A paper describes a structure:
[name] Envelope ([name]) is the main vaccine target for induction of neutralizing antibodies. Stabilizing [name] into native-like trimer (NLT) conformations is required for recombinant protein immunogens to induce autologous neutralizing antibodies(nAbs) against difficult to neutralize [name] strains (tier-2) in rabbits and non-human primates. In recent years, several modifications have been found to allow the folding and production of trimer proteins that resemble the native viral [name] conformations, or native-like trimers (NLTs).
[name], which is the most potent neutralizer of [name] pseudovirus, was chosen for structural characterization. A complex of a [name].MD39 version with [name] Fab was formed and we obtained a density map at 3.8 Å overall resolution. In our structure, only two of the three exposed epitopes are occupied by [name] Fab, despite extended incubation time with a large excess of [name] Fab. Our structure confirms that indeed [name] Fab variable region recognizes a conformational epitope comprising C3/V5 [name] regions. [name] HCDR2 recognizes a pocket that comprises the D-loop (E275-N283), V5 (S460-R469), the N234 glycan, and R456. The latter (R456) partakes in CD4 engagement and engagement of R456 by [name] HCDR2 suggests that occlusion of CD4 binding may be part of its neutralization mechanism. HCDR1 further stabilizes [name] binding by interacting with the base of helix α2 and its associated N355 glycan bridging the paratope gap toward HCDR3. HCDR3 makes extensive contact with the N-terminal part of V4 thereby facilitating order in this region (N386-V401). Interestingly, W395-V401 folds back on itself to display I396 and V401 for stabilizing interaction with LCDR1.
Author numbering:
A (entry chain C): 32 to 58, 65 to 142, 151 to 184, 189 to 309, 312 to 322, 322A, 323 to 397, 412 to 504
B (entry chain G): 190 to 241
C (entry chain B), D (entry chain F), E (entry chain D): 520 to 545, 570 to 664
Amino acid sequence: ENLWVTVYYGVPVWKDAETTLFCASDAKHNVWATHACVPTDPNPQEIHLENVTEEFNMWKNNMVEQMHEDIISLWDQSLKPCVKLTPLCVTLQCTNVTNNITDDMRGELKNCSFNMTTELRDKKQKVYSLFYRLDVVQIKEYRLINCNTSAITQACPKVSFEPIPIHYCAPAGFAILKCKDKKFNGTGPCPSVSTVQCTHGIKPVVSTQLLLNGSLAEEEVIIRSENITNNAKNILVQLNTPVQINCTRPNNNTVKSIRIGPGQAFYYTGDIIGDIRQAHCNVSKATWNETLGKVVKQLRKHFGNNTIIRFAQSSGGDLEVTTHSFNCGGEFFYCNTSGLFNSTWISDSITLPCRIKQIINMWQRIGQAMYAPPIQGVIRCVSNITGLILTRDGGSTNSTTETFRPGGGDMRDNWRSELYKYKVVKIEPLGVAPTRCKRR
Amino acid sequence: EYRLINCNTSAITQACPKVSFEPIPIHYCAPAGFAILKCKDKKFNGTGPCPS
Amino acid sequence: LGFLGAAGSTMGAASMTLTVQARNLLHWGIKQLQARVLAVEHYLRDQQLLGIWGCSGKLICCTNVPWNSSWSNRNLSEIWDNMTWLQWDKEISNYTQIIYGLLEESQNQQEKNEQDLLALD
Amino acid sequence: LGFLGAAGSTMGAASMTLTVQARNLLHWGIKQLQARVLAVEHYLRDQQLLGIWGCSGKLICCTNVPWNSSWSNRNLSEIWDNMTWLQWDKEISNYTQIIYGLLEESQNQQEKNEQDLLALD
Amino acid sequence: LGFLGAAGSTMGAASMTLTVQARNLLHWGIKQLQARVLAVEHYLRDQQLLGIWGCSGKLICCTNVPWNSSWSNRNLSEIWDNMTWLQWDKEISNYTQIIYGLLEESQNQQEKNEQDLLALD
Ligand SMILES: *[C@@H]1O[C@H](CO)[C@@H](O[C@@H]2O[C@H](CO)[C@@H](O)[C@H](O)[C@H]2NC(C)=O)[C@H](O)[C@H]1NC(C)=O
Ligand SMILES: *[C@@H]1O[C@H](CO)[C@@H](O[C@@H]2O[C@H](CO)[C@@H](O)[C@H](O)[C@H]2NC(C)=O)[C@H](O)[C@H]1NC(C)=O
Ligand SMILES: *[C@@H]1O[C@H](CO)[C@@H](O[C@@H]2O[C@H](CO)[C@@H](O)[C@H](O)[C@H]2NC(C)=O)[C@H](O)[C@H]1NC(C)=O
Ligand SMILES: *[C@@H]1O[C@H](CO)[C@@H](O[C@@H]2O[C@H](CO)[C@@H](O)[C@H](O)[C@H]2NC(C)=O)[C@H](O)[C@H]1NC(C)=O
Ligand SMILES: *[C@@H]1O[C@H](CO)[C@@H](O[C@@H]2O[C@H](CO)[C@@H](O)[C@H](O)[C@H]2NC(C)=O)[C@H](O)[C@H]1NC(C)=O
Ligand SMILES: *[C@@H]1O[C@H](CO)[C@@H](O[C@@H]2O[C@H](CO)[C@@H](O)[C@H](O)[C@H]2NC(C)=O)[C@H](O)[C@H]1NC(C)=O
Ligand SMILES: *[C@@H]1O[C@H](CO)[C@@H](O[C@@H]2O[C@H](CO)[C@@H](O)[C@H](O)[C@H]2NC(C)=O)[C@H](O)[C@H]1NC(C)=O
Ligand SMILES: *[C@@H]1O[C@H](CO)[C@@H](O)[C@H](O)[C@H]1NC(C)=O
Ligand SMILES: *[C@@H]1O[C@H](CO)[C@@H](O)[C@H](O)[C@H]1NC(C)=O
Ligand SMILES: *[C@@H]1O[C@H](CO)[C@@H](O)[C@H](O)[C@H]1NC(C)=O
Ligand SMILES: *[C@@H]1O[C@H](CO)[C@@H](O)[C@H](O)[C@H]1NC(C)=O
Ligand SMILES: *[C@@H]1O[C@H](CO)[C@@H](O)[C@H](O)[C@H]1NC(C)=O
Ligand SMILES: *[C@@H]1O[C@H](CO)[C@@H](O)[C@H](O)[C@H]1NC(C)=O
Ligand SMILES: *[C@@H]1O[C@H](CO)[C@@H](O)[C@H](O)[C@H]1NC(C)=O
Ligand SMILES: *[C@@H]1O[C@H](CO)[C@@H](O)[C@H](O)[C@H]1NC(C)=O
Ligand SMILES: *[C@@H]1O[C@H](CO)[C@@H](O)[C@H](O)[C@H]1NC(C)=O
Ligand SMILES: *[C@@H]1O[C@H](CO)[C@@H](O)[C@H](O)[C@H]1NC(C)=O
Ligand SMILES: *[C@@H]1O[C@H](CO)[C@@H](O)[C@H](O)[C@H]1NC(C)=O
Ligand SMILES: *[C@@H]1O[C@H](CO)[C@@H](O)[C@H](O)[C@H]1NC(C)=O
Ligand SMILES: *[C@@H]1O[C@H](CO)[C@@H](O)[C@H](O)[C@H]1NC(C)=O
Ligand SMILES: *[C@@H]1O[C@H](CO)[C@@H](O)[C@H](O)[C@H]1NC(C)=O
Ligand SMILES: *[C@@H]1O[C@H](CO)[C@@H](O)[C@H](O)[C@H]1NC(C)=O
Ligand SMILES: *[C@@H]1O[C@H](CO)[C@@H](O)[C@H](O)[C@H]1NC(C)=O
Ligand SMILES: *[C@@H]1O[C@H](CO)[C@@H](O)[C@H](O)[C@H]1NC(C)=O
Ligand SMILES: *[C@@H]1O[C@H](CO)[C@@H](O)[C@H](O)[C@H]1NC(C)=O
Ligand SMILES: *[C@@H]1O[C@H](CO)[C@@H](O)[C@H](O)[C@H]1NC(C)=O
Ligand SMILES: *[C@@H]1O[C@H](CO)[C@@H](O)[C@H](O)[C@H]1NC(C)=O
Ligand SMILES: *[C@@H]1O[C@H](CO)[C@@H](O)[C@H](O)[C@H]1NC(C)=O
Ligand SMILES: *[C@@H]1O[C@H](CO)[C@@H](O)[C@H](O)[C@H]1NC(C)=O
Ligand SMILES: *[C@@H]1O[C@H](CO)[C@@H](O)[C@H](O)[C@H]1NC(C)=O
């Protein structure tokens, strides 16, 4: 009939949008966000949206990029007041350590000495310290790793590396949607959708080949990838059960320090008390055996019936991607994961060797490097696997078998495991309608 | 033999010779939506109700 | 009854919550400020559209622009009682700029002149 | 009668100055930006609240919410002549959340529906 | 008649374009933010001034404050047909603050009182 344009304001309609999110945390010095952010809402609200099928796509989620940039900038701030080690690039003559030692690959630990500067410009001192083979390159005469490629900064010993959960909250005019559907593969319409003011806290845990200290799947192991048929893509696997990791460093190392210049001091590994033994991490055999069987069953659903599934160690690449990185106590460990992936599937514990490196580059940036200070005493660290990163050696159509190897090298993929649940939308309050009416 | 005091503690920066340390009076002003109240009382000890 | 709780409701039912929705529309330091400044600017721009239409005093208003029903062949009961606002916004997504242009030009321009003529005498 | 000169005056006398008060409501660069953005966000919040009440066009308006005598056991002449706004604001500070909620529920939500029905018919 | 195209026209003709003009009124990070914030504060202050005058809902309005014959020695039709707004603004630039004060003081202060009495009844 005689229909007319009408206008409504406050209309409950939203559109896809990207905006800066405000960081907050539930949390003395720490490298993490607690210094750069504000307190959270003690009682977060959630509203279920009935009859809503809103589409999610984790692979396009901009929240991943926003977190990455905040984490990198956040981490860099912690090194700005800290000591520079530029004076330490020297001839560094070294010899083999001889002691009551079960050792490792021979030459792994070395006794080194160098001419070092003092508080006064007029004076020098002779010092010695222990170094790991990974941090030393032969020119006998030696150089520290990256002495010809980058400046090295010593991390301040007072600052903790222990992860602190980070929450993100919407600005006014925006809302964060959450997918509640169980067994969601990260894409397509979500059967159950709710709105939250803020996200659940996410810890910035850094690891390779395995995802540590994250969320678990609600019912069954979930396998997802940007493209399941493309062997190039990383496959993220979320476990529905925990598997622990027990790492230790038994050697009882000691720490000594010397003042360098008027404003700086250097910390180094001193004599080791007692027998010298290999650092290592345990993985339970029985638990892992069950865990693999569950993953294989789910893989068969994606890759078809009667395909023989095998696992193997990475064929190549840098230590960062061929080994499992840890940060325990501030010490950086690299472990050989072989024996976790050493299996074929058709139908009490494992001990992995580890190596310690004091010079690291967590974000793989060229021209950057950090020196961790040594930690005094024996270290024990207990954490758990909540997922895996896998890649295929396949893409071949000429076989009835398939093989998987660990992936890694991109930190953003770890955050996807917690952020796949969330989407950001903008609220558009204005709209119009046909209903018949009259006005003067 | 001598050492400059605190060479064992900190870097020392020379003050620039062209920069005066002479005090300059500073006034503080409110942003919009705010106002500053001033007590006009005498023999006020800095606390309690101000009569003016 | 909470924010966006109306999303699953029919367009008619949703009208009960419009006021509730309105209340919620209003280095790192730079990023935070940019978000807040833009949120304010966006809010003000929507208010300007209403101000031109003369609808700024109300959440709900009528206009003098005819519906031109050929835009969508639906009955009022088919729209108001059987559909959400989310679905509706898609149905008229290609006509929104037209409707807004009609409101600013075909209504406000006639109304301001008639009101002025009455004021003059 | 300068800014806040009315603060010591009786609530009735204070009404003469409401316009004057309204006129005054509206890393160094970061300090300037934070102060200015907050001043604007605050200003808009007060205006939005009046807009819900429908009082945004006036400094003074009436509403359809009846007074609950339990909020204050006083006569009208008692409040207007024997009290300042500073004293009054403290006296009913427990009930301001209630009054604001009543204004929306009893007037804004009710009137927009009745007026829409008249417009529809 | 594009943006400011009206400036070349006489004052009467310019009234056709008021809506067009209205649409356009609304380290490195500091420059961006300060420019945006100042633009917003200026915009809001003009709306506040109209709100005091009671003309906030209209592009054009009339008041009951009489024109002082000393403000300009011109005929009414002369001003509308023989001048541009750019010229007109200069001729009364000495009296703008006086006119603004009169609108606020001489009229709106009385209307709010009469409305209170009518509402009271
Ligand atoms: C520390 O001792 C080990 C073991 O003798 C040295 O490694 C040997 O190096 C020689 C000479 O090139 C080789 O012929 C051997 O095969 C190495 N033995 C191994 C790998 O078991 C190592 O060079 C010594 N380190 C230093 C600094 O002298
Ligand atoms: C910094 O020094 C290292 C060690 O000399 C260089 O790495 C060597 O590169 C040459 C090129 O002829 C190779 O033959 C060696 O095998 C490398 N040595 C090691 C231990 O890997 C490095 O190239 C120098 N600078 C840069 C930027 O690489
Ligand atoms: C998650 O599962 C959905 C199905 O629930 C996948 O959607 C597929 O989309 C493609 C588009 O070309 C269709 O051809 C498929 O038929 C759909 N599903 C199936 C089973 O074929 C979606 O791609 C999945 N996401 C991922 C990352 O695998
Ligand atoms: C590991 O080394 C530390 C020292 O770095 C040992 O701690 C010492 O324990 C003895 C016990 O009598 C104390 O008297 C010392 O004062 C301690 N040294 C400190 C606190 O610096 C520790 O016992 C060693 N652990 C062993 C041998 O298992
Ligand atoms: C990981 O498992 C290994 C093997 O059971 C543990 O090795 C034993 O450790 C105890 C001391 O805790 C020694 O007395 C045994 O001789 C070790 N057995 C060996 C070397 O075969 C290891 O301690 C476990 N790690 C942790 C942190 O519990
Ligand atoms: C982890 O350890 C294994 C050995 O246990 C390394 O692999 C060996 O590589 C050699 C040379 O290709 C083979 O001959 C061996 O058969 C491999 N394993 C064996 C024999 O058990 C593997 O490279 C190590 N991983 C890393 C990252 O160093
Ligand atoms: C994963 O979380 C667990 C539990 O918080 C971590 O274990 C704790 O580590 C801190 C820091 O060393 C200790 O103060 C706690 O006492 C530990 N809790 C225990 C032993 O129950 C574990 O370190 C985390 N993993 C990572 C990689 O951060
Ligand atoms: C869908 O909307 C209707 C509206 O009456 C509501 O009753 C229903 O609960 C909503 N969803 C479900 C699953 O019921
Ligand atoms: C090795 O053990 C022996 C016997 O306890 C002890 O005498 C010795 O000090 C230890 N190591 C060295 C380098 O002497
Ligand atoms: C330190 O310098 C002296 C004098 O040249 C030299 O004899 C000594 O070997 C140097 N020490 C080291 C560790 O190089
Ligand atoms: C996965 O990659 C294959 C390569 O042939 C492509 O055909 C297919 O469309 C991709 N699937 C996607 C993008 O979902
Ligand atoms: C750590 O030790 C516990 C027993 O204390 C064991 O249950 C668990 O599997 C271990 N975690 C590993 C080996 O990752
Ligand atoms: C390194 O060599 C020096 C030679 O004097 C020795 O005194 C020192 O104990 C050695 N350090 C270790 C850890 O063996
Ligand atoms: C894991 O346990 C099963 C029995 O539950 C056993 O058959 C299998 O051999 C074990 N591990 C491997 C790699 O097969
Ligand atoms: C293989 O196919 C059968 C049905 O013929 C099915 O029951 C079984 O689960 C399949 N195995 C897979 C998908 O691994
Ligand atoms: C890995 O698997 C191969 C093939 O079955 C076997 O020969 C090898 O011994 C296994 N490695 C370990 C450490 O069990
Ligand atoms: C895995 O480790 C985390 C560390 O915070 C702990 O909270 C969680 O309960 C662990 N899961 C287990 C032990 O199943
Ligand atoms: C620096 O020398 C002063 C001389 O009084 C002494 O008091 C102070 O402890 C020294 N500082 C350090 C860090 O040794
Ligand atoms: C419906 O509106 C369109 C413009 O959006 C117009 O072209 C068409 O003629 C209209 N139908 C009528 C007026 O019947
Ligand atoms: C809309 O529905 C009414 C009854 O509510 C009916 O009378 C009318 O014909 C319908 N309009 C159409 C189908 O265009
Ligand atoms: C409501 O719309 C659906 C499609 O969304 C349609 O299938 C159904 O018939 C409609 N119900 C009516 C018109 O009563
Ligand atoms: C509106 O435009 C979209 C493409 O952007 C088109 O798919 C849709 O059919 C159009 N709607 C109408 C009613 O023409
Ligand atoms: C203060 O009180 C006196 C009466 O005692 C009154 O005349 C005066 O106006 C009051 N001042 C103010 C600012 O209200
Ligand atoms: C006044 O407030 C009390 C307490 O909330 C309430 O019980 C009473 O019903 C209210 N009276 C209203 C209209 O009278
Ligand atoms: C308020 O009215 C009552 C009526 O009994 C009266 O007793 C009381 O004195 C009045 N209060 C004032 C301040 O006039
Ligand atoms: C108003 O609220 C305050 C804070 O709870 C309370 O102390 C005061 O007694 C209240 N006034 C009343 C209930 O009249
Ligand atoms: C008009 O202007 C004259 C001065 O030219 C002034 O004396 C008179 O008071 C004014 N009338 C007003 C402001 O009503
Ligand atoms: C105003 O009109 C009068 C006649 O009413 C005329 O005499 C006078 O010149 C006009 N003033 C002008 C055009 O400035
Ligand atoms: C305005 O009036 C003046 C009087 O000298 C005249 O010269 C001029 O042409 C007029 N402008 C017009 C009519 O546009
Ligand atoms: C306005 O003020 C200026 C000040 O220089 C003066 O020159 C001009 O004549 C004044 N205009 C009027 C109409 O008085």
